[PDB]
């Protein structure tokens with residue numbers, strides 16, 4: 013029955029207002045591959061809003077690997093990994109990821125989101141604590157809320173605040189610190205050296221979410237611990253397959269004993285169907301390409317360095333990025349919606365960040381690079397972004 | 407750092423004990439398609455532990471649809487639906503599911519699990535209530551824990567308990583009742599007529615999880631509301647693609663206004679990458695086959711009725727199933743592990759249910775049918791289950 017339910021959704025007017033103003037730019041149906049240009053309503057649009065940092069969702073070797081796994085294994089596993097849903101290829105991908113990030117063992121999950129729900133829900137319990145950077149990804153906060161522990165947020169990359177909050181806690185309690193590696197809103201990197209120095213002083217577990225780091229930072233893209241040399245100070249390396257690795261799913265890697273506990277105790281793997289064969293095979297082939305062909309990472313960074321220089325040279329106000337995520341400040345929700353829509357209509361796809369995710373005065377568009385971008389495409393998008401920022405009076 | 411973390415996992419000994427006793431039967435790597443027989447360590451095993459109720463993960467039309475979508479759309483969308491991760495085919499599948507279950511609109515999620523997290527986390531808030539059957543799936547409890555509401559469990563299919571608990575709540579509060587349609591542990595059906603009569607008297611929203619119901623009950627498999635004629639008394643129909651539909655993902659269907667609110671407010675869709683093209687295409691083709699070819703559902707039920715009769719005739723103790731899930735009571739955790747392993751070694755795959763999921767005295771194995779099972783395969787598995795139950799002294 014719908015009386016109270018209708019009242020619960022009654023105040024949510026922003027979508028109807030964006031649509032009626034002709035500003036609504038969400039859920040655009042793309043008609044093509046995710047690539048440097050996409051097709052929407054039959055036309056071509058430059059894509060600067062993707063997480064496919066290495067451009068690999070169009071790699072024919074990865075497409076064929078997935079098609080071959082469909083041929084051999086079919087469309088789905090139709091069960092949980094612990095029962096009837098494990099394939100030989102899931103185990104192969106766990107062994108290959110463990111080798112890649114330098115850990116004993118790994119467990120896959122069917123999404124990146126569920127990869128954070130698993131360890132955050134089941135390791136810390138009653139009388140224990142989870143410490144979260146306040147800018148951590150939504151799946152980390154949600155995973156931590158599914159624990160029976162006390163969740164404490166600390167200021168963004170604020171090591172004095174982390175240390176102070178750890179200092180207040182009972183000695184006879186377990187603690188876990190969970191952080192994004194690269195944070196996707198400003199593209200900044202966690203202070204892993206100081207965070208792990210603090211974790212060691214308080215004997216806190218460390219988990220790093222490398223969604224935006226794998227294929228981006230670290231030796232051969234192996235992530236944030238690799239970038240800092242701190243593999244031995246990080247208990248759990250989490251990653252996703254939905255960004256550089258061109259697929260869907262994620263993993264948690266760490267010591268065999270911890271991984272054995274997770275794979276039998278995390279509800280998000282015990283009670284959810286396993287990755288499809290096609291996604292396992294595409295992740296395996298993408299992982300082989302990222303390591304064997306260094307050109308993908310190198311050009312991602314050539315594009316990132318070029319576009320960042322060009323944006324700063326044209327006088328854009330950039331956030332404190334250290335990654336291929338170039339946050340461009342607009343500082344008005346209304347201008348951010350207007351710029352986003354006018355750019356889409358003019359052939360450029362960027363992603364808006366608006367209230368209530370951020371304050372109006374910090375509203376921005378995210379311009380993300382892919383290894384497959386050309387300097388001509390970057391130049392075309394920046395020319396159009398100068399024109400639209402002119403029209404919008406930013 | 408690992409001192410307290412090592413202490414947190416120290417008491418978890420059951421897996422090391424099962425392995426050392428030679429009883430461990432979990433995470434078996436299958437080397438073939440999910441089918442009526444699977445290959446494990448090179449040998450052939452009858453599969454009676456699957457959720458693929460219609461046998462469709464091997465349908466060449468569904469395999470080819472997925473391979474064609476890889477060819478056209480690549481391996482992944484690399485973003486959230488609201489940004490750069492919507493395809494025309496996602497929208498097509500939402501419109502087709504809305505038509506199938508008889509609702510205005512639908513929103514996909516990348517897993518069934520995340521399909522429950524979405525509506526349960528974001529509709530009821532502070533000062534509101536979620537009412538859950540105590541046997542609801544883990545993803546429903548977890549979704550409800552991610553709300554800011556008060557979560558109340560009621561006794562399993564206990565309508566007097568549901569009504570009593572609703573009666574205690576403030577009138578000036580929203581309420582939502584969430585139930586599995588078919589419950590997977592005993593295979594029983596929710597009392598939807600009485601639950602919806604109570605919901606109407608208290609103006610509570612109703613959500614049904616039809617993971618095990620789609621392709622199983624209802625007209626052309628359209629689920630639990632369809633089975634009872636109660637579409638107009640159910641606000642939200644949730645389903646998964648990982649069972650009859652042979653794929654990965656799920657959806658929530660309902661009124662356009664409610665679905666518009668969810669798709670913009672559910673963290674599990676705002677902050678998680680969209681279904682891969684291959685999985686969208688396989689779900690679309692499976693959905694077309696389930697409706698157009700009635701033989702799949704009919705034979706699922708011919709197999710279910712045959713196997714249930716044969717189990718009862720051989721004197722097995724069955725749970726209160728109304729579905730293709732045939733729960734066989736063993737009532738000893740040690741016998742359940744032993745029977746499960748001896749059956750696997752002898753060529754039969756069933757799924758154990760043990761403490762702490764259930765009391766020792768209610769421990770059981772689940773024997774599930776698929777439309778593609780033959781009566782000969784059913785007979786072979788029951789012959790082997792009689793032999794192993796003899797050896798185990800059940």
Ligand SMILES: Cc1ncc(COP(=O)(O)O)c(CN[C@H](C(=O)O)[C@@H](C)O)c1O
Pocket residue numbers: 090091092282283284285286457517518519520522543545586590615617618646647648654655656
């Ligand atoms: C009633 C119900 N709802 C939701 C889900 C989650 O849907 P999924 O993410 O697509 O798996 C399941 C999963 N049931 C199986 C289980 O919990 O064993 C799982 C393996 O598919 C379920 O049984």
Ligand SMILES: Cc1ncc(COP(=O)(O)O)c(CN[C@H](C(=O)O)[C@@H](C)O)c1O
Pocket residue numbers: 063123124125126128149151192196221223224252253254260261262484485486676677678679680
């Ligand atoms: C830091 C981080 N962790 C975990 C996840 C979840 O991984 P997924 O389930 O594979 O998507 C994301 C998703 N980031 C994107 C986002 O939140 O917009 C999402 C679309 O992929 C992320 O940015």
